[PDB]
Write a structure and sequence with these properties.
CATH topology of the largest domain: Lysozyme
Organism: Escherichia coli (strain K12 / MC4100 / BW2952)
Family: Belongs to the transglycosylase Slt family.
Number of strands: 5
Order of helices and strands: HEEEHHEEHHHHHHHHHHH
Enzyme class: lyase
Bound molecules: a molecule of 4 linked components (NM9-NAG-NM6-NAG)
Protein name: Membrane-bound lytic murein transglycosylase C
CATH architecture of the largest domain: Orthogonal Bundle
Distance between the termini: 42 Å
Number of domains: 2
Helix content: 40-55%
Largest sheet: 5 strands, antiparallel
Strand content: 5-15%
Subcellular location: Cell outer membrane
């Protein structure tokens, strides 16, 4: 904890409200790419579970030209998440021949956008034929909205399978778990970043799981930001932690179906917080879960776990897994 990132993050938001007003302060999250440009007068927001691509501007002077350029930028940007500050209005020149959204959003024509020529056209279509308006209360906000292909999620999840597969055998963790979580945590968003700076596809925070993992493997110190914005490594690492919550921390839990529930919950709020729903004594806790049927452990973790986020998440990961279980 020697960051000082907090000071920038705090003035990013305020830079926003200075222009957008407190009510219109939208910002990057796990399931939402959001990038300001044009001195914070322009927003490119990808929503990875809706999954829409609203581009808005509030510049007074030439709204279209401002919008235009965001559309082309969002549609063509290559998925280099490491070269990308989702907290500056600085230009992350990430134009690639291999767009991150290629396969995930289409022309009005119905084709994939790959080069500036179609990107320009999809843009120009939308500015002449899909433009919209709302108000701050103060200024008009001009908006374009783009829906992504209906299976954008499993089209996005496809990038990370080779990674999930490798990490699943290395550590012993079911890919289904890895995907369920990865899905639930980021909707497969490589740009994913939390308010509590959990990072990347598996929403991993450097100074808890990232430390403990690095502490296995035999690595003094702590995972780099770039490191977690490598899908290959973030998936390595979230998985490594899943292994860990199961071998050590929640390994005193007898029943493996019960243990998984603990693991999942724990993956989101810590093993200490899981065990602490039964006893403040980590042994007594394990003893009590072994008193139970995996369904009552589920129904406990789902009803009595202190975090709202963590109760609503078990059903999310447990449910996503059922889908991923079969091949
Ligand atoms: C929405 O996305 C966010 O998700 C990630 C998961 O995706 C959330 O991050 C999880 O947050 C947990 C903190 O809430 C964190 O667990 C804490 O983990 C550490 C590390 O293992 C535990 O401390 C270790 O504890 C053992 C003792 O059991 C000691 O041996 C170790 O030495 C400790 N090691 C280190 C390095 O500290 C900590 O538990 C201990 C025991 C404790 N009682 O303090 C554990 N927390 C709790 C309550 O038990 C997870 O590590 C992390 N998961 C991942 C993958 O990173 C994130 O949560 C935030 C930060 C939150 N809950 O507010 C999610 N949410 C947001 C909003 O961003």
């Amino acid at each position: 904890d020697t960051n000082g990132f907090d000071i920038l993050m705090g003035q990013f938001a305020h830079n926003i409200e200075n222009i957008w007003g407190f009510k219109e302060v939208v910002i990057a999250g796990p399931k939402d790419y959001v990038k300001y440009t044009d001195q914070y007068q322009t927003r490119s927001h990808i929503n990875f579970d809706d999954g829409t691509i609203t581009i808005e501007t509030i510049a007074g002077t030439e709204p279209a030209a401002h919008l235009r350029r965001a559309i082309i930028k969002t549609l063509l940007m290559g998925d280099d998440p490491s070269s990308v500050d989702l907290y500056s209005d600085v230009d992350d020149i990430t134009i690639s021949k291999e767009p991150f959204l290629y396969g995930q959003v289409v022309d009005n024509t119905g084709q994939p956008i790959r080069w500036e020529g179609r990107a320009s056209n999809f843009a120009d279509y939308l500015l002449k034929n899909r433009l919209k308006s709302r108000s701050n209360g103060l200024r008009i906000i001009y908006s374009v909205t783009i829906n992504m292909v209906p299976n954008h999620l499993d089209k996005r999840a496809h990038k990370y399978l080779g990674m999930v597969r490798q990490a699943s055998r290395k550590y012993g963790v079911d890919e289904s778990l890895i995907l369920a979580i990865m899905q639930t945590q980021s909707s497969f968003n490589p740009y994913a970043v939390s308010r509590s700076d959990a990072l990347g596809l598996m929403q991993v925070v450097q100074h808890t799981a990232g430390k403990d993992v690095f502490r296995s493997q035999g690595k003094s110190g702590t995972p780099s930001r770039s490191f977690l914005f490598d899908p290959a490594s973030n998936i390595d690492t979230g998985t490594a932690y899943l292994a860990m919550l199961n071998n050590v921390y929640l390994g005193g839990i007898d029943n493996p179906t019960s243990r998984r529930y603990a693991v999942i919950t724990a993956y989101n709020g810590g093993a200490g917080s899981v065990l602490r729903v039964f006893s403040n004594d980590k042994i007594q806790a394990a003893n009590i879960i072994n008193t139970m049927t995996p369904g009552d452990v589920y129904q406990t973790l789902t009803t009595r776990h202190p975090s709202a986020e963590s109760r609503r998440y078990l059903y999310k990961v447990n449910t996503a897994q059922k889908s991923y279980r079969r091949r």
